[PDB]
């Protein structure tokens, strides 16, 4: 997030980090319940990658984070990688996340929900802060 700002530790309890087995953060994601994570289809997640919940400072060893494994990767069949349309993948955890103060679910809207232009929303992530 270019020009973003540091979040309050644990205030975005659904934010997860997709890391390869090397420990390298490559994508973000959101928990929609204890067994499923929603992420982008472009991320190219495989079952060797790990979902880390409860994390704030990727460079700390004292955090009580949860490294969860992926059972199956569900790439939306409507996903078009040439237009980058329908960019959503569901990840089923082989080991369910344990919900607490720093780990919980984000709500999903109804297909009929309206979010008008001009509305201020928030986006979070560990992506580049300067390019």
């Amino acid at each position: 997030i270019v020009n973003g700002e540091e979040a309050v530790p644990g205030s975005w309890p659904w934010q997860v980090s997709l890391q390869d087995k090397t420990g390298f953060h490559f994508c973000g994601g959101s928990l929609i319940n204890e067994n499923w994570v929603v992420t982008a289809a472009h991320c190219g997640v495989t079952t060797s990658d790990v979902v880390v919940a409860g994390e704030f400072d990727q460079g700390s060893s004292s955090e009580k984070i949860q490294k969860l494994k992926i059972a199956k990767v569900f790439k939306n069949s409507k996903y078009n990688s040439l237009t980058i349309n329908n960019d959503i993948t569901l990840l089923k955890l082989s080991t369910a996340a344990s919900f607490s103060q720093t780990v919980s679910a984000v709500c999903l809207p109804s297909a009929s929900d309206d979010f008008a232009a001009g509305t201020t929303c928030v986006t979070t992530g560990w992506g580049l802060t300067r390019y």
Binding site: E55, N76, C121, T123, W126
Partner: protein, 95 residues
């Protein structure tokens, strides 16, 4: 990338106003936000774009793409969850 989790407020745009920046690349399962001095960037993909609706944070978009340079004056493009939620519902029920 940064060690600590970052956040940023940003405005949703109309798909019409976004087509001014992106023309025909803006499809129906896409929603725009930003062009306000902040931008999602590499490493942010898959992450959430949340809006507070009736007291709770609900998932409106998924970081998908945008300016290759992460220009804070160009709007970012997110997967429109409202157009994909029926598939999520189907998937969670079958599996």
């Amino acid at each position: 990338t940064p060690d600590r989790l970052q956040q940023a407020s940003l405005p949703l745009l109309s798909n019409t106003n976004c087509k001014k920046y992106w023309g025909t690349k803006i499809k129906d399962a896409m929603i725009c936000a930003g062009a306000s001095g902040v931008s999602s960037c590499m490493g942010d993909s898959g992450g959430p774009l949340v809006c507070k609706k009736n007291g709770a944070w609900t998932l409106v978009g998924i970081v998908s793409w945008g300016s290759s340079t992460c220009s804070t004056s160009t709007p970012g493009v997110y997967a429109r969850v409202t157009a994909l939620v029926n598939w999520v519902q189907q998937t969670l029920a079958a599996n």
